[PDB]
Amino acid sequence: MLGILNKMFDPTKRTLNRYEKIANDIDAIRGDYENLSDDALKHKTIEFKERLEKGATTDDLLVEAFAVVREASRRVTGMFPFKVQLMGGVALHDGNIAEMKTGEGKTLTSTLPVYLNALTGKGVHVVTVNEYLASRDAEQMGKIFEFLGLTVGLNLNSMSKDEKREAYAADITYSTNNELGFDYLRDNMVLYKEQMVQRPLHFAVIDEVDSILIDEARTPLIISGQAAKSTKLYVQANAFVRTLKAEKDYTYDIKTKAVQLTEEGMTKAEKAFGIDNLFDVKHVALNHHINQALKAHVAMQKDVDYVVEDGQVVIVDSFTGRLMKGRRYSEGLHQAIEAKEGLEIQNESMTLATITFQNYFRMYEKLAGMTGTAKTEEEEFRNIYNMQVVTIPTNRPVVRDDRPDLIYRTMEGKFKAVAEDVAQRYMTGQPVLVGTVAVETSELISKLLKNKGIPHQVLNAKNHEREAQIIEEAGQKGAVTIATNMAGRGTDIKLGEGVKELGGLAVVGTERHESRRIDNQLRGRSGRQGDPGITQFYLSMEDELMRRFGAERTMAMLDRFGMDDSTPIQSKMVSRAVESSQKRVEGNNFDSRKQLLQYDDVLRQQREVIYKQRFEVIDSENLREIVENMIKSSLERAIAAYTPREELPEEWKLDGLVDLINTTYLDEGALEKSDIFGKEPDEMLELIMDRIITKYNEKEEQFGKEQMREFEKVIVLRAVDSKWMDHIDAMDQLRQGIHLRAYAQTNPLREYQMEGFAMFEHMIESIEDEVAKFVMKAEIENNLEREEVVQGQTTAHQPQEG
Amino acid sequence: MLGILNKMFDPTKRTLNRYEKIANDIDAIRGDYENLSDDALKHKTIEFKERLEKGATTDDLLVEAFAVVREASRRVTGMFPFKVQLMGGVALHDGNIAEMKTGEGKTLTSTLPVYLNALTGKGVHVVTVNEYLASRDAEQMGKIFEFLGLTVGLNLNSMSKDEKREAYAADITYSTNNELGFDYLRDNMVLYKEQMVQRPLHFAVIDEVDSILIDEARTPLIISGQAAKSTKLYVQANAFVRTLKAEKDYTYDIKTKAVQLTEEGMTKAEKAFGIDNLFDVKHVALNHHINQALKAHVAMQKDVDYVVEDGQVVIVDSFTGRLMKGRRYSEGLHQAIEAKEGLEIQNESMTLATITFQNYFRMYEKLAGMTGTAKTEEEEFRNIYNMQVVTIPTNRPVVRDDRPDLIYRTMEGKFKAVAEDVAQRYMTGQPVLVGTVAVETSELISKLLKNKGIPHQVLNAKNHEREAQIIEEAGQKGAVTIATNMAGRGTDIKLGEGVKELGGLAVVGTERHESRRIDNQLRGRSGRQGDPGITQFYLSMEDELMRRFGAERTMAMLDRFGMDDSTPIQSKMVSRAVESSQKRVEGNNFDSRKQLLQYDDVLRQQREVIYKQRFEVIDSENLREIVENMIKSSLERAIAAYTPREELPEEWKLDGLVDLINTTYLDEGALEKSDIFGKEPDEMLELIMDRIITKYNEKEEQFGKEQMREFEKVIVLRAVDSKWMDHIDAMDQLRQGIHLRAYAQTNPLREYQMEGFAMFEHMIESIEDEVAKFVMKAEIENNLEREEVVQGQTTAHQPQEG
Numbered sequence A, B: 001m002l003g004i005l006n007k008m009f010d011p012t013k014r015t016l017n018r019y020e021k022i023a024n025d026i027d028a029i030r031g032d033y034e035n036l037s038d039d040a041l042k043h044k045t046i047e048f049k050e051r052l053e054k055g056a057t058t059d060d061l062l063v064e065a066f067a068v069v070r071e072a073s074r075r076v077t078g079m080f081p082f083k084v085q086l087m088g089g090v091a092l093h094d095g096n097i098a099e100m101k102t103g104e105g106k107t108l109t110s111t112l113p114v115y116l117n118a119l120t121g122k123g124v125h126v127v128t129v130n131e132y133l134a135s136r137d138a139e140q141m142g143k144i145f146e147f148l149g150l151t152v153g154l155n156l157n158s159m160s161k162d163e164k165r166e167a168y169a170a171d172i173t174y175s176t177n178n179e180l181g182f183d184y185l186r187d188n189m190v191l192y193k194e195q196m197v198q199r200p201l202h203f204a205v206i207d208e209v210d211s212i213l214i215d216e217a218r219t220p221l222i223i224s225g226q227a228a229k230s231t232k233l234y235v236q237a238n239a240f241v242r243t244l245k246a247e248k249d250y251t252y253d254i255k256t257k258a259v260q261l262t263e264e265g266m267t268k269a270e271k272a273f274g275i276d277n278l279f280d281v282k283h284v285a286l287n288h289h290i291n292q293a294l295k296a297h298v299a300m301q302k303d304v305d306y307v308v309e310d311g312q313v314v315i316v317d318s319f320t321g322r323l324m325k326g327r328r329y330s331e332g333l334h335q336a337i338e339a340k341e342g343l344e345i346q347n348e349s350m351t352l353a354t355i356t357f358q359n360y361f362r363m364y365e366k367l368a369g370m371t372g373t374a375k376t377e378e379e380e381f382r383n384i385y386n387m388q389v390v391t392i393p394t395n396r397p398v399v400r401d402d403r404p405d406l407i408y409r410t411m412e413g414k415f416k417a418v419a420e421d422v423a424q425r426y427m428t429g430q431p432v433l434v435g436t437v438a439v440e441t442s443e444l445i446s447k448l449l450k451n452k453g454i455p456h457q458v459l460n461a462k463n464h465e466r467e468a469q470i471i472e473e474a475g476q477k478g479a480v481t482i483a484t485n486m487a488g489r490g491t492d493i494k495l496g497e498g499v500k501e502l503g504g505l506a507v508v509g510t511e512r513h514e515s516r517r518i519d520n521q522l523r524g525r526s527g528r529q530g531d532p533g534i535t536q537f538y539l540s541m542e543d544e545l546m547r548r549f550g551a552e553r554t555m556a557m558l559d560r561f562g563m564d565d566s567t568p569i570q571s572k573m574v575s576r577a578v579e580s581s582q583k584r585v586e587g588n589n590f591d592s593r594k595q596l597l598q599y600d601d602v603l604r605q606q607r608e609v610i611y612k613q614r615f616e617v618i619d620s621e622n623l624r625e626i627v628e629n630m631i632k633s634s635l636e637r638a639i640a641a642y643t644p645r646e647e648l649p650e651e652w653k654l655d656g657l658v659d660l661i662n663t664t665y666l667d668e669g670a671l672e673k674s675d676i677f678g679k680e681p682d683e684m685l686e687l688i689m690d691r692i693i694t695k696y697n698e699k700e701e702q703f704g705k706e707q708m709r710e711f712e713k714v715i716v717l718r719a720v721d722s723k724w725m726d727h728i729d730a731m732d733q734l735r736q737g738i739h740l741r742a743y744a745q746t747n748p749l750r751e752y753q754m755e756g757f758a759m760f761e762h763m764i765e766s767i768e769d770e771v772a773k774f775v776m777k778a779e780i781e782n783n784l785e786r787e788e789v790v791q792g793q794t795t796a797h798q799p800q801e802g
C-alpha cells in the first residue's frame, strides 16, 4: 500500500523476504545439479536421508532438497519451477498457506515441501477436494517423487483395508479430505491393531484449503449404524423383572444397586431359559438388559427421577426441578424405563463416531495448504490452524481486466443481457466462460443460448474427469462454456490457437456468490500468467444476495427515480454494499464453524482419553495392571461411599459395604464385620484390593494363564466400546437438543460442556465397574474372541449444512 | 486420580516430572555454593552475565542460577528454598502459572526466575494487586536481588516521571498491574521520546494472576480529558460560514472539498480578525473548525446524509437507509452539523487512550504468574495468555479439615449460627477467621459478636498495611478476625504460641463467593505447611447465590417437608448445586472477558499501526521520506478519483483534477490542461509528485533546513494526535452504542469490526491529507514546538464492572 496503513503488511513482508532470498540461494546452485546423471541425482535423496539420520533438519536440507526437486522436474516433466513456486514451497514448509493465484502451479509447488518432509519416512498427506484431482495429481506428480525414488500411495473409498494400508504405507499419500477423515474414524473402532489403515498423522499439505478447511467444514463427519429391532428384549426384560420382588434380589439405598446374583434372581432368571447360566455369552449380552430393567423399577421412580409424556420420557433436573432439554439415560436405561412405562421405545441409527475437519487436521504434527483465495479469511486460518496466509507474487504480471459489477432491476434483464455479451464474444472468437451458482441458472442461460444459435457446453459437477476434458479446451476460439459453481476447478484453461490476439478468455459471472472468495475464483480463470482476459459480473436488485441485505429501500429509490430506465448501472457504492453483504454472510458462516468447533472441543478432550485408552488396550501385552487399576478405582468408589464425609468413623455403616463387596466383587461370605473394622477408608481399600488380587491370581492358574490376557482385552473392549458408542450418540443428541428450553441465561455451549463432562465422568465409572464385575465374576465358556459391538452395517457420511 | 480418567492429567504430569528432576539437579550442587565467600557468590552473577553474552541460554544457566539464588537467600534471609519452590520458579521460567497453594512461599520463589531472566538486563516486571505488597515485596526480596548485585526499582503513582523512569531503569521492577498499564498508556501520548518512563516489555511475573488477569480484568483502562467549553467556536464557525456562498470559495462534487483558499474566503475570513492570516497558529487550530463547518453546509445535507432529532443528529446508513446506531462523524464535523442545525452540541470527557489488561500483558516477550487458585480457569489462562497451569506439590502434606458447607433456611439462622461457632472456638483458644463478602455482612456479625462478649477485629480493605499488621497476629489464641473479601491477602498467618495443640486456625465462611476460586482462597488461610485447621462454610436458602439459581422449587420441598425443622443440613447434592451455580457465574464472567477482549482486538490492531507510526515520528532524524510517502499517498488518491474505473482515458475530466492539485497542494496556476494530458493515472502521479518534490525542496532552503525536520514532526504529531484521540473516543462510543438497534442478524462485534476498520481507514486518509496540506501550504510564523493536543487535565481510571 501507500501511506501509513502499510504496517499491517509488515508481518507478511518480513517473511516474504526470507523466502525471496532463499529462492535465490536455490537458483544459485542451479549449476550443482544442472549437469549430473539421472542416477546420481536419485542418490541425492539417499544423501539427504543419511544426512538427516545424522542430525540435520529439514530446514537445513531445504535449499538443496528444493534444488534437487527443481532439477528432477525439468528432467521428468520438462518444467523448471519458478522463483515464485520456490517461495510457495517454502511457505508450505514453514506450515503456512500459500496464496498463489489460480494458475501459478500450486501442484508442482507441493512437490518441494512434500518431498523434503517425506524423507524422514514419517509420511505426508497431500489432500484435495475430489477423487479425480487426487488421482490425477498423484499420477503426474508421482513421477517426480518416484524418480527421486520415493513411495507414492493413493487412497480412495473403493479400496480394501489392505489396499488402504498399502496406500498409507507409502512415503507419500494422496486422498480426499473426506477419505482421510473417515479413515481416522474407522481406524478407531478397530478390534485388532493390525486392522488400522492409517499411520500417525505427520504432515498434511492441503491443495485448496479454503474449500476444504472452510466450505466443506460447515458440518461434521459421522458414522451411524442401527439396532436390530431388539425391542423384544426390553419388553421381556421389563415383564420378567417385576416378579422376584424380595430381598433374595438385592438393592442399594446408598449405591442404588440392582443386585440380581441371589439364587431367586439367578435361578428364576435361568428359568427364562437363558441357556442356563452361561455368564459370558449371556451376562455380557442379556444380563445387561436385565440389570437395566431392574434399576428402572427399583431405583427409578416415575415422577421424582423422570417424567412421562406424550413426547415420551424426560429427566428431571434434580435440585432445580426442570424438564431436562435433551438428555437420555446412559446404556439404554432410558429404554428400560419406557418399557416399564409402556411408552414406544425408539431405535434410530446411533452415531458411532464423529470428528470435525477442523479438529482432524488439527491433529497433524504439521499442516499447510495452498490456494489462490485465502487472505479473505486469514483471520480464520491463523486463528484455528495457526497458519498465516502468505500471498505469493505472480510469475508474470497480471494484465486481466476486472470489470465493475453491472446492476439490473430484474433477473430477466440481467440474464437476457448476459446472453448478448456471450453472443458478441462468440461472434469475434473470444472464448467465454459463464459462472452460475446453481443448476437452474446454468440451464436457463443454456436455453437463452441455444435460442440465440450460440453452441455451448454446460458443466454441472458430475464425473469431474468428463468435465475436466471439456473445460481444458474451453479456452479455444468457439469456446462457450457454462460452469455451475466452478465445476472445473483445478484444471487450467490454456489460451487457444490465435485467441491470444482475440482478447483473452473473458469470463462472465451471472451473479456473485455468498463469498468474495468464490466469485473471485471465478475471476481467477482468466489471465493465466500474464495472459489477457476480461471479467464481467452481473447482478440485479431482485437477487437473493440483495433481498437478504434488506435492500428494499434502495430498490425503491431507483424505481421512484426512474432508474430502471437507464438500466445497466455501476455504482461503486452499491457494489461496496454487496461487498459488505458478503462479508456478513461469511461472518455468519465463520460464526457457524466457530460454534461447531466449540461443541466438538468438548468431544476431542473426551476422545483424547478414550481413543488413547483403547489403543492402550490393543498394545495389550501387560494388560492386567490396568485391569487392576480399574477394579481398584471402582472399589475405592464403593468404600468412600460407605464412609462419607467423616460421618462418625467406626460409626459409619460397616456392614452393608461389607456385605456388598462380598457380593459384587467376591461371591458371598469372605468379607465380614470383623474383616474390616477400625480402619480408615484408605486402610480398607488396600486390605480388600489385596483379596481381589488373591482372587485375580487364582483365575490365571485356573482358566488359562495367557487366555486371560485376552479375556481381559475382550471384556475391556466390550466395556469401552459399548459404553463409548452410546455416550457419543448421546452426546450428539444433546448437542442439538440443548438448543431447546433454555432460559438458563448461560450460553448452551456452557451447559453442554458441564453436562457433557458429567456423563463422560459417569461412563468412565460405568466402564471401570463393568470391567471389574466381569473380570472378577464372569465365567469363561468357549471362544474368548474380541467381539464387535457395532450392529449390522455401518454408514460413513457428512450431513448437509443444516 | 485412579482408573481411566487419569489421562487428562498427562500434559501436567509430563512437565511436572522434568521440573522434579531439575529441582534435584539443583539440590545436587548445593555443595558448590554452600561454602563460598559472600563476594565470590556475587561474582557468580557476573560469570553468568558474561557466559550469556557469549551465547548461552537462560535455560542453560538455570540450575546454577537457581543454586546461586538459593544460597543467596539463606545467606540474606536465612531461608533455603524448598524443592517445591524450585519447581515453581522453573514453571515460571517456562512461562506458566505456578499454582502453589497459599503459603508455599510464592514470594521467595519469584526470585529464581526473576533473577535469571533479569540478567540480560532487559528488565523484569514483578507485579501485584496493591501498592502495599508491591513495596513490601520489593523491600524484602530486593535484599537478595541486590546482594547478587542487581538494580531494583519500585513504581507507584505518586512518583514523578523521572522517578518512574529510574524505577523502570532497574534490572527489575515492582509495580501494580494498574500502574504498569496506565504507564504504557501515558507512554504513548508523549511528545518527545525522552519523556517515556517504560522500557520495552520483556518479562512479567504476576503474583496472584487470578486476581489480576481474571478479576481486575472485567473492565478496561481509560484516560479521559475534557474540552474547554469551546462551543463558542462552532457557533461562530457555522454563522460565519454561510456567508461567502460563491465560487470564490470552492467545492467538490467528486471529492467533496470545501476549498476556502480563495481570496473571498481568505480575505473575508481574516476579516473575522483571525490575527490576519497566521496560517500556522490559526490554520492548524481555527481553520480546522471552519473547514468542518463549511462541509457541514455544502456537503452535508439535512436528511440525505444525516437526520435531525430530539436525541440530536443521526447518520443514515447509505444504501440500506438506516438509523446509524451509535456513530459520530470524525474530527468534530458532527458538532459543525449540530451548530448548522442549532442543536445543543455535546462536550463530554473524551477517552484519550485505552487497553485491556489482557491485551497489555499479552504485549510481553514472556509472561508468567503464580497463585494458589488457578486450575479453576486453566482453560482461560492457556487460551488467552498461552500459560498452562501447573499445580506444584506442597512442601509438607496438608492436614486441614475442610468441612461440608452447612445450609440454613434463613440468613438470620445462618448468621446467628456463625456467631456461636466463633464463641465455641473463642472459648477454647482456637483463633477464628470469618470471611464475609461485603461490608454489611462483616459489621452485622461484629454486632452479634460484641453482643456475645467476644472481642474481635474487623478488616474491610483500607491501608492494607494497617490490616496486614492486624491480620498477621490473627492466628494467636484470642484471635477473632473478620475479613471482608479476604482483606489481608498475601500476608500469611502463623500459628500462635500454643495454638498448635488448640486445633489450628479454623476459618469460617459466612457464605460462598461467586467463584470457588475465591471461597477456596478463604479455605487457603489455614494449614500453612502441614499446620492443622478447620474450614467451615455456611449458606442459606435465602442467599443471593441461591435466589439467582432459580432455587425456589427446592426452597419449597424443604418447607413442604418440614425441613427448616432439622435446620443445619448437609446435602452433598445441594452443595454440588451451588458448585454449578458458581461455574455458571464464572462462565458468564469468562464470557464477559472473552467479549471485552474481542472488541479490543479490533483496537489493538489499530494501535499497532498508530503507536508504531507515532514512535517512528519521534525517532525523527530522517522524517521527510515519510512525509513524502504520505503526501504521495494523498495525491494518488486524488488522481485515482479523477480517473475512475477506466471511464474513457483522455475522456476522464482532466480539468477539475488539474485545477484541484493546482489549488490544494500547490498555489493556483502551475498545473493545467496540457501539463497532464495523455497520461495514465500512474504516469501522472510521478509527474506531479515530482513538482511537489521540487516545491518541498524549495522550503528547506527558504525557511530553515533542519527547523523543517521539526516542522514536519510538529505537523505530523498535531495531525496524528488530533485525529487518533478522536477516533478512539469515537471507537469507545461505538463499542457501547452498537448494542442498540441491531436486528441486522449479524453479531455486533462483526459490525464493530467492519465499521471500526472503516473509520480507521478514513482517519489514515485524513491524517495523510492534513499532513500533506500543511507541509506544502502551511506557513511558519514563530516557535515550531511540538504541541500538546490534550486539553487541560487528564484522568487515568478503570471503570466499574458495568
Ligand SMILES: Nc1ncnc2c1ncn2[C@@H]1O[C@H](COP(=O)(O)OP(=O)(O)O)[C@@H](O)[C@H]1O
Pocket (backbone or CB within 6 Å): A078, A079, A080, A081, A082, A085, A100, A101, A102, A103, A104, A105, A106, A107, A108, A490, A491, A492
Ligand atoms: N515450472 C513450470 N514451468 C512450466 N509450466 C508450469 C510450471 N509449473 C506449472 N506449470 C503449468 O501451469 C499450470 C498450472 O498448474 P496447476 O497445477 O494447475 O496449478 P494451479 O492450481 O495454480 O492452476 C499447469 O497445467 C502446468 O502445466
Ligand SMILES: Nc1ncnc2c1ncn2[C@@H]1O[C@H](COP(=O)(O)OP(=O)(O)O)[C@@H](O)[C@H]1O
Pocket (backbone or CB within 6 Å): B078, B079, B080, B081, B082, B085, B100, B101, B102, B103, B104, B105, B106, B107, B108, B490, B491, B492
Ligand atoms: N524457603 C523458605 N524457608 C523458610 N520459610 C519460608 C521459605 N519460603 C517462604 N517462607 C515463609 O513462608 C511464608 C509464605 O511466603 P509468602 O511469600 O507469603 O507466600 P505465599 O503467597 O505462598 O503465602 C513467608 O512468610 C515466609 O516467611
Ligand SMILES: [Mg+2]
Pocket (backbone or CB within 6 Å): A106, A107, A207, A490
Ligand atoms: Mg491446483
Ligand SMILES: [Mg+2]
Pocket (backbone or CB within 6 Å): B106, B107, B207, B490
Ligand atoms: Mg504471596
